[PDB]
Design a protein around this ligand. Sequence first.
Ligand SMILES: CC(C)[C@H](CO)Nc1nc(Nc2cccc(Cl)c2)c2ncn(C(C)C)c2n1
Length: 256
Amino acid sequence: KADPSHFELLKVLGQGSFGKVFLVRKVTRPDSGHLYAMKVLKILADVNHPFVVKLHYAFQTEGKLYLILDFLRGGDLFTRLSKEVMFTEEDVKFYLAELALGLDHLHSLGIIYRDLKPENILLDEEGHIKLTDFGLSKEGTVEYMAPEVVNRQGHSHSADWWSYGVLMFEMLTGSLPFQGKDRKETMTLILKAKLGMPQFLSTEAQSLLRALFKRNPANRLGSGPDGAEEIKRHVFYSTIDWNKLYRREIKPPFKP
Ligand SMILES: CC(C)[C@H](CO)Nc1nc(Nc2cccc(Cl)c2)c2ncn(C(C)C)c2n1
């Protein structure tokens, strides 16, 4: 059975906001040689979906909870965003569509992806995305918080779609829609939900952002009754075949 001795440490990927994540190589059969990302801890984690990180092994060792997950070669969207400082609508439509599927699934499991942001969206070698650091059902980066969360008036699935809107805006413009000089001001800007629409954005993109940026979570796109479909049927994704996207048949615009 699983055991820390079955994995040799290759290198530390980075300090964590969830513990430390190491790049490990399994030493035991049958996946001997296979690379994995190892997370050590001192609430669901098992989800099966093309756009959600897979948990391969989980074992407790005296206070330490080891999680062996997929190693995503491509790194995260935050890193790519910083280097390219903004993606074309083409790239954005693609990442958001796959994210749309991943997110909705997590919502069906009754999970709320509270920490949705580019840092938590990984890319595999093919360029497809994979959501990480999810799981919590019973609840951060302020720039991504929905107004009901800032005011602590609740935190349902709707909150995620607002954050989804923020991710879209940041990838499309290189900037955050609501940014103050400090956390306080940012939260106040989120509450006013006062938003200027950059003129280089397509009308379809602008339409979608306006629908996602509804202060009242009940009027926010994704708030049913067709839930995620409400967002998937938006004109912004007209050219997206969800069937093949799910099957990973759509060619990623970016290849790491
Ligand atoms: C430690 C952080 C700097 C990074 C990026 O957010 N985290 C990260 N990078 C990953 N991949 C990755 C690939 C190439 C270079 C670098 Cl620095 C990271 C990764 N693969 C699988 N997971 C989790 C499910 C644990 C991962 N998590």
